[PDB]
Amino acid sequence: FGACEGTLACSTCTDEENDMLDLALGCQ
Amino acid sequence: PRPFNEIPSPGDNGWLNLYHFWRETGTHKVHLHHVQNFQKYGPIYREKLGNVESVYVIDPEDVALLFKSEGPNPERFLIPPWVAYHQYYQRPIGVLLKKSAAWKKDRVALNQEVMAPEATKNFLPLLDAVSRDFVSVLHRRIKKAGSGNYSGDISDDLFRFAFESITNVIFGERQGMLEEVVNPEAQRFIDAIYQMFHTSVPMLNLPPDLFRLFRTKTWKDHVAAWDVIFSKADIYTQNFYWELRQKGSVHHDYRGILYRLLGDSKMSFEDIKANVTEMLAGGVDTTSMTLQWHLYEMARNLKVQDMLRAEVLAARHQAQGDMATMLQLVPLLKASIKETLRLHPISVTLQRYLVNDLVLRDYMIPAKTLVQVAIYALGREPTFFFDPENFDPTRWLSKDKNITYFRNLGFGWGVRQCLGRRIAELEMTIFLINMLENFRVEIQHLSDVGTTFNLILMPEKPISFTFWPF
Ligand code: HEM
Numbered sequence: 001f002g003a004c005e006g007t008l009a010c011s012t013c014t015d016e017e018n019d020m021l022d023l024a025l026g027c028q
Numbered sequence: 029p030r031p032f033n034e035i036p037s038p039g040d041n042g043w044l045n046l047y048h049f050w051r052e053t054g055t056h057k058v059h060l061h062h063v064q065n066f067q068k069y070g071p072i073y074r075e076k077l078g079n080v081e082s083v084y085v086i087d088p089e090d091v092a093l094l095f096k097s098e099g100p101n102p103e104r105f106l107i108p109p110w111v112a113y114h115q116y117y118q119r120p121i122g123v124l125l126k127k128s129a130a131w132k133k134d135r136v137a138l139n140q141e142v143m144a145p146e147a148t149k150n151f152l153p154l155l156d157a158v159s160r161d162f163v164s165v166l167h168r169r170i171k172k173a174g175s176g177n178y179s180g181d182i183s184d185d186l187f188r189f190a191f192e193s194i195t196n197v198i199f200g201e202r203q204g205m206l207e208e209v210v211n212p213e214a215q216r217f218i219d220a221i222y223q224m225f226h227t228s229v230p231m232l233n234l235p236p237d238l239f240r241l242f243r244t245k246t247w248k249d250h251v252a253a254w255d256v257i258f259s260k261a262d263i264y265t266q267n268f269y270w271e272l273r274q275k276g277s278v279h280h281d282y283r284g285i286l287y288r289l290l291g292d293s294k295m296s297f298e299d300i301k302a303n304v305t306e307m308l309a310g311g312v313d314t315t316s317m318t319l320q321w322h323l324y325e326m327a328r329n330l331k332v333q334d335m336l337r338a339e340v341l342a343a344r345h346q347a348q349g350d351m352a353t354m355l356q357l358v359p360l361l362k363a364s365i366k367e368t369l370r371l372h373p374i375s376v377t378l379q380r381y382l383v384n385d386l387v388l389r390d391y392m393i394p395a396k397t398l399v400q401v402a403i404y405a406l407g408r409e410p411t412f413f414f415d416p417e418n419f420d421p422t423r424w425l426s427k428d429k430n431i432t433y434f435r436n437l438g439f440g441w442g443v444r445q446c447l448g449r450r451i452a453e454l455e456m457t458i459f460l461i462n463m464l465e466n467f468r469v470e471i472q473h474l475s476d477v478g479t480t481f482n483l484i485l486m487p488e489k490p491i492s493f494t495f496w497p498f
């Protein structure tokens with residue numbers, strides 16, 4: 001959980017949120 | 029659950045495999061080798077090339093399983109000529125060549141300044157200033173041409189653009205690479221970058237012991253290219269460091285990535301400079317070639333170009349001019365970048381070394397195996413994308429979220445995806461906003477342009493565009 005540390009650079013937890021999601025956020 | 033050895037394979041002799049690869053397809057067509065291999069062996073195969081064995085996959089469902097079992101500190105394939113150069117000449121390594129805890133430490137530091145929304149919002153006016161100047165260059169060329177019109181190969185200009193862009197967000201200073209008279213030393217840097225990649229290829233499947241022996245000339249040239257990269261990155265960073273002490277003010281305006289790291293980060297100076305070197309070198313050939321492909325795809329599909337323009341004009345009006353706002357109003361533009369990277373990946377593969385054993389397609393793959401996702405072959409694969417030779421950005425908008433499951437792989441996945449992903453996305457989206465507002469793009473005597481493998485994938489031959497004031 002939170003491996004990238006609240007940076008929106010993973011998915012362990014906007015248009016960019018959509019991209020991280022199509023591969024399966026808590027910090028946003 | 030079948031054993032590893034049962035995975036379809038050309039054979040166990042890596043040097044023989046390498047031989048057949050070179051004679052039938054060639055080093056600069058590795059992406060075709062993958063396509064042909066999948067047509068030959070089905071959806072999964074293993075190949076030893078020289079000393080390195082990988083399992084190759086194409087199916088987004090296998091991809092999902094791969095990235096599912098990923099550990100806290102993932103490793104991808106390391107490029108042997110790059111690694112050897114750094115070791116033998118003892119150059120400081122950045123995030124790209126580190127593993128485990130030392131990688132995490134750099135990545136986390138850099139992520140706060142390069143991937144984080146709070147930081148990346150500052151990039152907007154810095155990138156826009158470069159894009160706006162690129163548009164000016166072209167307007168000048170149209171005026172000079174005297175025909176209401178400009179035709180030309182703009183590859184060199186796209187390299188200079190990409191260089192202004194990455195230097196501007198890192199240093200907060202213009203390098204003047206879009207002016208009529210250009211810094212020849214900065215050009216020498218830009219060229220070294222392409223040389224570094226190009227000279228990587230003849231050494232790709234060989235252990236360092238065989239480089240100096242059979243690729244002596246290529247190795248020599250490769251070393252010279254990295255020397256330019258490192259010399260000038262060092263000079264830039266060092267000058268910046270001292271000038272900071274010469275003007276020493278706690279500025280309230282945003283000043284760039286370097287200023288932020290040097291002023292408030294857990295990284296040592298040597299770590300910082302190593303990563304500045306990599307971000308600079310990483311940023312020149314990537315966004316530039318991708319933009320070139322995008323412009324090519326807009327010229328190939330004029331209807332799609334019309335739709336994208338209309339979206340951007342609407343978005344500029346709706347946002348009453350504000351760039352930050354615009355960027356939330358161009359979903360078709362963003363999808364078109366995704367569509368460009370599917371047909372034209374920069375990276376032929378993604379790779380992970382397994383931490384634990386893993387089953388894929390009922391085959392047992394042991395820990396420490398290299399698995400490679402054939403990203404190029406995937407994007408051309410008619411069973412994974414409907415009508416794959418067609419440039420269709422709407423594909424990424426579909427509410428059938430089965431159609432986009434693990435398909436957007438151009439920048440990789442998870443904690444070790446592209447570090448420059450936000451810089452690249454923002455730079456390309458802003459670049460294309462500005463171009464779409466100013467020019468119509470065509471290619472006279474248009475023909476199919478193929479792909480060559482120059483470590484990064486690049487067009488096989490030049491693309492000469494025609495630009496019309498809009
Ligand atoms: C269209 C533009 C670009 C594309 C398609 C691209 C693609 C990639 C890919 C596929 C990876 C491997 C990711 C993985 O293994 O999961 C990567 C990693 C990396 N990229 Fe990019 N890239 C682009 C632009 C850039 C830029 C502008 C920079 C400069 C900041 C950059 C710097 C890096 C670095 C340092 C890594 C290694 C990161 C790590 O190991 O933690 N890239 N990129």
Ligand SMILES: CC(C)CC[C@@H](O)[C@](C)(O)[C@H]1CC[C@H]2[C@@H]3CC=C4C[C@@H](O)CC[C@]4(C)[C@H]3CC[C@]12C
Nearest residue numbers: 105124306307309310311314374375376377483484
């Ligand atoms: C100049 C460097 C400091 C930064 C370069 C970086 O910005 C690149 C271009 O973004 C690099 C980073 C990782 C690289 C990949 C790592 C592994 C492989 C496997 C190899 O078989 C083909 C090349 C390929 C697919 C590489 C292509 C170029 C990549 C994708």
Ligand code: FES
Nearest residue numbers: 002004006010027
């Ligand atoms: S913690 Fe990395 S995405 Fe939220």
